[PDB]
Structures are given as C-alpha cells and as structure tokens.
Design an enzyme around this catalytic site. Structure first.
Site, PDB file in Angstrom:
ATOM      1  N   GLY B 186       0.846  -0.996   0.093  1.00  0.00           N
ATOM      2  CA  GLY B 186      -0.064   0.020  -0.018  1.00  0.00           C
ATOM      3  C   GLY B 186       0.947   1.108  -0.074  1.00  0.00           C
ATOM      4  CG  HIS B 449      12.159  38.667   2.136  1.00  0.00           C
ATOM      5  ND1 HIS B 449      12.384  37.730   1.132  1.00  0.00           N
ATOM      6  CD2 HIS B 449      13.313  39.031   2.435  1.00  0.00           C
ATOM      7  CE1 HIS B 449      13.477  37.478   0.765  1.00  0.00           C
ATOM      8  NE2 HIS B 449      14.209  38.328   1.400  1.00  0.00           N
TER       9      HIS B 449
END
Ligand SMILES: Cc1cc2nc3c(=O)[nH]c(=O)nc-3n(C[C@H](O)[C@H](O)[C@H](O)COP(=O)(O)OP(=O)(O)OC[C@H]3O[C@@H](n4cnc5c(N)ncnc54)[C@H](O)[C@@H]3O)c2cc1C
Ligand SMILES: Cc1cc2nc3c(=O)[nH]c(=O)nc-3n(C[C@H](O)[C@H](O)[C@H](O)COP(=O)(O)OP(=O)(O)OC[C@H]3O[C@@H](n4cnc5c(N)ncnc54)[C@H](O)[C@@H]3O)c2cc1C
Ligand SMILES: NC(=O)c1ccc[n+]([C@@H]2O[C@H](COP(=O)([O-])OP(=O)(O)OC[C@H]3O[C@@H](n4cnc5c(N)ncnc54)[C@H](O)[C@@H]3O)[C@@H](O)[C@H]2O)c1
Ligand SMILES: NC(=O)c1ccc[n+]([C@@H]2O[C@H](COP(=O)([O-])OP(=O)(O)OC[C@H]3O[C@@H](n4cnc5c(N)ncnc54)[C@H](O)[C@@H]3O)[C@@H](O)[C@H]2O)c1
Lengths: 473, 472
Positions: B186, B449
C-alpha cells in the site's frame, strides 16, 4: 537610449521589485546599482540579499543545526560523536547562496526587460538622473518618473568606531572566519540578537549591552518576557540599562566601558559587534537643485503614496518613513509602479508583520497588549503554549506560545503574537485573517489540520472567548 | 446513572465532543475500552496511541538522523559518526504518548467529564450498556448519545498478521531494530510515512501498490513530484503491483505479486500491511437500537452527524467523510453545540490533507484534475522552493506551491504544496478560502521576507501572470 519611463536608483528589495513590476506594467524601466559583490562585479539585491536578511538566515540555520546535533539529539536516540562545525565552510555556503540569488535578480531583470546600469545615480532637477559608471564616466538618463530606493546602512557611534577586524558592524559579523571566544554586541535589537545567537551556538561567550531598560519594546510584553528568559538561557548575556560610553583596542581585544544601574563597568571581548540601528542613505544622491527634501532624521520626505515633494519622483524602502523591513520596501515598490501605470493601488501599513529569526522564532502582526491598553481599547486575550501541542512534542520543540488579541466588544482580531516553532508562518495565517477582518470566533470555527503547529493558533483563538479544548479556560 | 450526553469512544472525535459538551454545561460521560502500555485504559484513540502522534514522532526523529547523515557537510558540520538507537527512539515516542494520553484524562477531570472503562453498546431508547473490564454490565440513561467508535486497519488474506514478521501500522511503530529489507503493501499515506521512517534509518524499502495511479486524491502535478522525490529517497514504489500471497519461513517473508510483466516474488525481513482503514461497529449497536449502517459499514448520518434515531449522533472515522483526526474533532464540537441548542454546522469543503513525509505534502480544496472533470475553467499559478531565499538558507529547496483559481471570478479553489512547512502554507490558503479569497486578494497582502510563506504569495501572483520572482 537615454530615455526611460521609470528610472530606479538602487536594486534592493525596494528598487529591484519596483523595477520588475514597472516592466511588467509595460513601462520602459532602468535600474541603477553600484554595490560591488564578492566577485568584483556589481551585485543586485541590496542590503537584504548581500549583507542582511539572507546571509543572516543562512548562518542562523547552519548554527542551529549544529546546536541541535550537539545538545538535542540524544533524546531521539541519535548519537553523533565529535560533532564539529567549520566556520569557513559555513560562511562559504552563505556566500554561495548570496551569489546564486544575486545572479537570480539579474536573470529576472533580463526576463522582464529591465535595463541595468552599473554605477552611482544622482537625481538632478526635473527628473534627470546622472549615472557615474564604474570607470568614473558620467551620463544623464531622462526619466519620466524616478523611484529612489537607496536604502540604509548601519548607525555609527563614536564610543565604538569600526576598527580593523575587532570592532565590526553587522556586515563584518557575517564574515568571521573563526568563532570569537568572547563576543560583545552593542544593541539588543533584532540584528544584535540574531548575530549573537549565531556565534553563541558555536561556542562564543556573548554579552549584549542594551541601553534601554525595556527588552524588545515593540513586541508584546508577554512575548518579550519569554524571549528574554529563553535567550538568556541560550547564553546571550543580555544586559539591559547598559549604555556603552567608550572602547579601547589593545592586544587584539577590545575593552568596553559602560554605565549600568550599579555604575561604571568594563568588559573585554575578542570581537565587538555594533548593532545600534540603521540610518537612511542619501550620500551624493540628490543634487542641490533636485527639489527633494529630507526630514530632520535624514529620511526622504514622502506622503502616504511614497511621492516626494517633486512630481514624478517617488522614494521607497529604508530611505523613507515606516518599518525598515524588506517586505515593506518591496510592497512600496509595487505600489509606486502600479500608481505610475495609472492604478489607484493602496498600501496597508497596519498588517506588516515583524519576524525575529532567533530559535525560538518570534513574530507578530498588529497591535500589542500594551499598545491597546494605552489606546484605551478593552480586549480579550487568548494564549496557547507549544508545551500543549502534540506536533511540537513530536518535534522536541515545545518552547513558547501563541497569543491572539481581540476587541472585547466586536471580537475583531487586533494582534497575533508568537514565540515558538514556525512563528512567522502562524503569524502570516493571522495576518491573512486580519486582512479579511477576522474575528477570534471566525478562526475558531475553521478546520485546522492535526497534528500541526497551526493548531496552536486555532486553540489561542478559541481561548479568546474561553473555550479552547486543550487547555483550561 | 443519568447523563445528558454519553460518548462511546475517546478518540479525537469522542474526547473532544465530551470536553465541549461539558463546557456547554451538559452532564457528560465518556466510555473507552482501549488498554495502553501501562495496562490501564488509555484515552486519545487511534490518533494519539497508534496513529498521528506516534508516527510523527518517529518521522521527526528519523528525519533528524537522515539530515545529519546526508545533509550536514554543506553547512560545514562534520561528525565522526552518526548512529541511531532504535529502542531509544521508540521509547521517546512511547513517553510522548504516555504524557498526551494522561493529558486527556487531566482535561476530562478539569471539565467534569465522567469516565467509564469498558465496552459501550447502544441499546434501544438511548440506553447505553457499559460492559466493564471485569465483564459486569451497567446501563446509563442518556438524553443524547455520541457514537465515536473509530476505525481499525484493513486486513487481507494474502498478508495475514503473523508474529512480528507481518505487521500493520501498529506493529510498524514498535520495531526495536531497523529491518534490513522491508516490504510495505500500500502506497497510501500510512505506507509512505512508515516506509519513510525505516528507509531513513537504513532499511531497503519496497512499497507494492496495486493501483496504477500514485496518490490519486492529490493534485497530479504534486503527486508526480512526490513519486520522483520519494523514489530518490529509497522508497522503491512499485505501481500496478498486486500482492496475492505471502509465505513466512525462518524469520523472513516471501511475497508473491502481479505486475505488468507477470508473476513476481520478493523476500523481506519484515512486511508492513498498509492497505487502508475500516470503520469499527463491533458489538456497538443492539439489533433494536434503531441506528442503521450503510452498505460499507459506516453509521448512517446526515450533515449534522445525526443518526436515524433522534438524540443519537455519530462522528469521526465511523461515519462518512475524510478519515482524519481534525474532521472527527470538529464533528464532535458541532454535535455537542447542537445538543446545547445551537444550529452549529460543519464545513466539509475546506478539510486539509497532510502527508508527513519530508518533503511534507498538503492540500486543501480541489485538484486540477477534479476541476477539469467538473468543467470549471481555471487559472493556475505555481512557485518552486528552488526560488525561495528562505528555503535556500534552510538547505531545503525541493517542491512547489500550486494555487488554482476560477478563471472567471478569480476565487481560489485549491491550494496544493509539496515542500517545507507544506501544512502551514496550506492552512494559510484554507483561511483565505474561508473568507472567499481571490488569487489577487492574496497577491495584494504583505508577506514577511524571508519566509516560506512567500512561496504561497508568489504562486497566487502567478495565477494572473505577475509573480515577481519567477518568469511569467
Ligand atoms: C544583518 C541584517 C539583517 C536583516 N534581516 C532582515 C529580515 O530578516 N527581514 C526583513 O524584512 N528585513 C531585514 N533587514 C532589513 C532589510 O535588509 C532592509 O529593510 C531592506 O534591505 C531595505 O530595502 P531597500 O531596497 O529599501 O534598501 P537596501 O536593501 O539597502 O538597497 C539599497 C540599494 O541602493 C544602492 N544604492 C544606494 N545609493 C545608490 C546610488 N546613489 N546609486 C546607485 N545605487 C545606490 C545600494 O548599494 C543598495 O543596493 C536586515 C538588515 C540587516 C543589516
Ligand atoms: C499510522 C496512522 C497514522 C495516522 N496519522 C494521522 C495524521 O497525521 N493526521 C490525521 O488527521 N489522521 C491520522 N490518522 C487517522 C486518525 O488516527 C483517525 O482519523 C482518527 O483517530 C479518528 O478519530 P476517531 O475519534 O473517529 O476514531 P479513533 O481514533 O479510532 O477512536 C475511537 C475510540 O473508540 C474506542 N472504541 C471503539 N469501540 C468502542 C466501544 N464499543 N466502546 C468503547 N470504546 C470503543 C476505541 O478503543 C478508540 O479509542 C492516522 C492513522 C494511522 C493508523
Ligand atoms: O537591531 P537593529 O540594529 O536593526 O536596530 P534597533 O534600533 O532595533 O536596535 C538598536 C538598539 O541599540 C541600542 N543602543 C544604541 N546605542 C547604544 C549604546 N551606546 N549602548 C548600548 N545600546 C545602544 C538601542 O537602545 C537599541 O535598542
Ligand atoms: O491510510 P492509507 O492512505 O495508507 O490507505 P489507502 O486506502 O489510501 O491506500 C491503501 C492502498 O493499498 C493498496 N492495496 C490494497 N490491497 C493491495 C494489495 N494486495 N497489493 C498491493 N496494494 C494493495 C490499495 O491500492 C491502496 O492504494
């Protein structure tokens, strides 16, 4: 060849963003820059990219990774024998990052059609800009609009003048090739705390001398109190109410004299960082007949749209009023370019976040509790500690808290303050909500992924109104 | 004896519902049967005991080891040797679980929730039978019942759990040594997370996935990058590979599977079965309780989690919707508030998904392929972390942010991220979407930023062709 719709002086966060945006809007745009980088060629990006934001964050990240490996690996079952850090290699990585990003700005200019000039720009009368090239020759550019983005430089103080490689400013502090054994820092502001943190992590014994009695006065008082406690434990010997009055260099060391509550003191260091603020740069920038005026502190005078006293001349970033931050400068650059192109674009100065890149990181947006008390606004406050965050526990990083402040009458969020992991990202979540006028209950009603650090903001918002799930209310 | 609210199960659904109900002034009981590591009942359900928290703990420890071994030299950091003590790593995880499960009991005590230890079964007429750990029964008279019985791993005959050689996710979180060769059945979220843990610590990991399409619920562009990056990290993900049999012998297991080239065999020291999750209704409902199940075994509920019996609700993994902890807990809050008389609703459109690989994967809203199938014209903007100054400083530049907006209204319809702080950036998008944000709305905001958040800002600007930091 000499005519442009927009001439930008400076290629820092203000100027280079303004130039790109102007070009995107169809304006024939030139950008003038004089700064010489490490390769001997002009390097764009201003203070922030070359000697500021990016270099400091690079050294903060490297030094923190070393610190965690040395002091916080055993709990995970990780044994690392003889972990060391080579300072020249650490600094060289930072230099390579700077080189890549400064080149990236040139690539963006080329892609957008910005014309670059190398040299010093000076504004003459009537929007003529004289460019002195690197060979000393001059030419004049005829500009329909001028955007001044000349930025800032470190404040100098007579008690601690830059001396050899012993007394340095933030630029020299990013270039040490060895860990200073005893490191002094003048100023416990953002820059002093970040630079002190870098070198303390690598073994420097750091004393930070701060003239004010109050630590981080712009931050929320509860955040600042936790920050002082945590940073002092990390080895930043932060001395408040301590004003440096003199220094003496001898035998490759510097002795600093300062006054504190107990009188005259002396302390000796191998290196001394002067981090006592920044000042606007107007050196040879404005001809006597330019028409552009300065305020009493040396900033270029502009209105709320960054227009100077001269039509068609604008000034943005660190050279004008407002928060001296890179994202503030760039947003002003965008606003000015859009206004030149005919758009009535507006700027919100009320939701500019602040970040201090210590670890734990500190960040906030909006108003502090003490500001709101001074303004007479009754508030409700909710907090949530990372000690109660499952995600933070898994991360082995549980210091700090999130704080949400809301108007007691309307429930409107007025401030979000964080010290802890991913502080800046959680503050940006708050800032986005505040742009839309979020209430505290608005945030509480949203689905936050589990397990994530973001859940701490969700719980703090619920705590505002007394129904957090995972702490007592 | 008498309670306003009786909650069956103390997982993210049940324990949050119980706390909220108590906060609202309702006399509340919560029944739980799971026995933890100390031999006493442990609250917190799958997520806290054998799910979310244990997995993230091992993911964080294993990632720190991996970074020290493979990504320190660039910083100038040298080690004379980095090693991992697996028993110690697992013990840290166990201690975190113990602290948090105890924390739930502390919250119950502080809020006045009454705990019962044992198995709860809903009888007719809102009576709840509690079978204690000694087999004795008592009946609680409930004005309202909240069923929150959760889920368990899917089992398949080709790979039955066997001693310590074939395990499910619970056993995979308890290995005391790195398996030399590890198989995983899976390639869903659980298989990828568990495979990542042990691959980082030196296991040779093969992931066998029957479907041809990787992460079909994720945006195709994100899934393609994820497959590339995770394969490079040593997860040998084999798509179109269906396990049909296994054989255990001499402390190893040989798996038989079918791929495009026919019948294949591969042998492992350990095999993890990670083939999905199923709802738990075992002995939960008397035959005459009045509560009905759908054909797939979930309790049938409306959009307010109300069952076919008034005053009986069901939440979390036992009912329809994303089988996620934050979905269960928010349903618990809604149900408790509705019992208290509030017309509380749940937003099923903005439930984010997170995969805690490194790079982390997260998304909220709709994928590009879903919107194309729905005939909705969209504009897409992306920004790569390779162009993020913050990510460069972090030495972590893999991945991208993707923003999808309606081509006519500019409304953001989906945000998808693979890269650093993916879940936090997706939560930023989800908050914007709650307020009906357009892409230009996000573009006009001030983003700090340097931060990873700027990648979302740039991606939003790219939607309409004017990102600053990438060519448009
Ligand atoms: C150590 C340090 C760390 C920092 N960290 C952060 C952070 O993390 N986040 C943040 O938001 N801010 C940070 N800052 C502040 C940030 O660097 C500034 O706010 C930002 O750089 C200002 O942008 P600007 O374009 O206005 O000015 P600048 O970046 O200073 O750019 C001005 C440009 O103009 C050039 N110039 C000047 N005059 C002329 C002329 N006549 N002709 C041609 N060129 C000229 C200069 O060479 C320069 O390149 C930091 C600062 C320092 C010192
Ligand atoms: C390895 C793994 C990792 C996972 N990672 C994440 C993740 O990172 N983020 C995320 O959102 N989800 C994750 N999940 C899924 C998450 O665990 C579930 O979505 C969540 O636990 C469901 O909450 P719940 O309350 O509905 O069910 P459960 O957590 O399963 O709780 C149900 C409780 O009810 C008990 N119970 C059942 N029947 C009875 C009864 N008759 N009487 C008394 N008690 C009963 C059970 O013992 C159990 O404690 C993960 C799952 C696994 C297996
Ligand atoms: O951080 P940043 O550099 O961006 O700016 P900043 O203005 O935020 O920090 C500068 C700090 O230096 C301190 N300072 C100035 N002169 C000093 C002196 N002689 N002695 C001790 N402290 C002094 C100031 O009080 C101030 O808190
Ligand atoms: O939680 P989650 O996201 O991990 O679960 P999930 O349900 O999302 O993923 C389980 C995966 O196991 C795979 N599966 C089932 N039987 C298989 C078999 N014999 N062989 C190979 N793969 C098989 C399925 O294709 C599925 O993709």
């Amino acid at each position: 060849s000499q005519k442009f719709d927009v001439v930008v002086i400076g290629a820092g966060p203000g100027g280079y963003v303004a130039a790109i945006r102007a070009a995107q809007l169809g304006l024939k745009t030139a950008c003038i820059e004089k700064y010489i980088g490490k390769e001997g060629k002009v390097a764009l990006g201003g203070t922030c990219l070359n000697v500021g934001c990016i270099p400091s964050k690079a050294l903060l990240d490297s030094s923190y990774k070393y610190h965690e490996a040395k002091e916080a690996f055993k709990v995970h079952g990780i044994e690392a024998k003889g972990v060391t850090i080579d300072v020249p290699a650490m600094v060289a990585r930072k230099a390579n990052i700077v080189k890549n990003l400064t080149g990236g700005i040139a690539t963006l200019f080329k892609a957008n059609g910005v014309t670059s000039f190398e040299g010093h720009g000076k504004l003459l009368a009537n929007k003529q800009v004289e460019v002195t090239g690197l060979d000393g020759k001059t030419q004049v550019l005829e500009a329909e609009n001028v955007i001044i983005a000349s930025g800032s430089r470190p404040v100098e103080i007579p008690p601690a003048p830059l001396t050899d490689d012993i007394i340095v400013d933030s630029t020299g502090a990013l270039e040490f090739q060895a860990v200073p054994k005893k490191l002094g820092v003048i100023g416990a502001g953002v820059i002093g705390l970040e630079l002190g943190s870098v070198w303390a992590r690598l073994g420097a014994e750091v004393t930070v001398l701060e003239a004010l009695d109050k630590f981080l006065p712009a931050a929320d008082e509860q955040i600042a109190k936790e920050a002082l406690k945590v940073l002092t434990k990390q080895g930043l010997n932060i001395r408040l109410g301590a004003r440096v009055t003199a220094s003496e260099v001898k035998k490759k060391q510097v002795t600093v004299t300062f006054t504190d509550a107990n009188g005259e003191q002396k302390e000796t260091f191998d290196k001394l960082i002067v981090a006592v603020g920044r000042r606007p740069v107007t050196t040879d920038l404005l001809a006597a007949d330019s028409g552009v005026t300065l305020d009493e502190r040396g900033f270029i005078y502009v209105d709320d749209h960054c227009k100077t006293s001269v039509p068609g001349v604008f000034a943005i970033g660190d050279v004008v009023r407002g928060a001296m931050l890179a994202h503030k400068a760039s947003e002003e650059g965008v606003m000015v370019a859009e206004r030149i192109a005919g758009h009535k674009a507006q700027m919100n100065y009320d939701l500019i976040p602040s970040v201090i890149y210590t670890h734990p990181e500190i960040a906030w947006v909006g108003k502090t509790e003490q500001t709101l008390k001074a303004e007479g606004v009754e508030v409700n406050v909710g907090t949530f500690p990372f000690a109660a965050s499952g995600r933070a526990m898994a991360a082995n990083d549980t210091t700090g808290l999130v704080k949400v402040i809301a108007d007691a009458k309307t429930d409107r969020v007025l401030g979000v303050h964080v010290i802890g992991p991913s502080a800046a990202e959680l503050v940006q979540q708050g800032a986005i909500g505040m742009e839309f006028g979020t209430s505290a209950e608005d945030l509480g009603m949203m689905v936050f992924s589990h397990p994530t650090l973001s859940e701490a903001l969700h719980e703090a918002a619920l705590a505002v109104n007394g129904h957090a799930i995972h702490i007592a209310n």
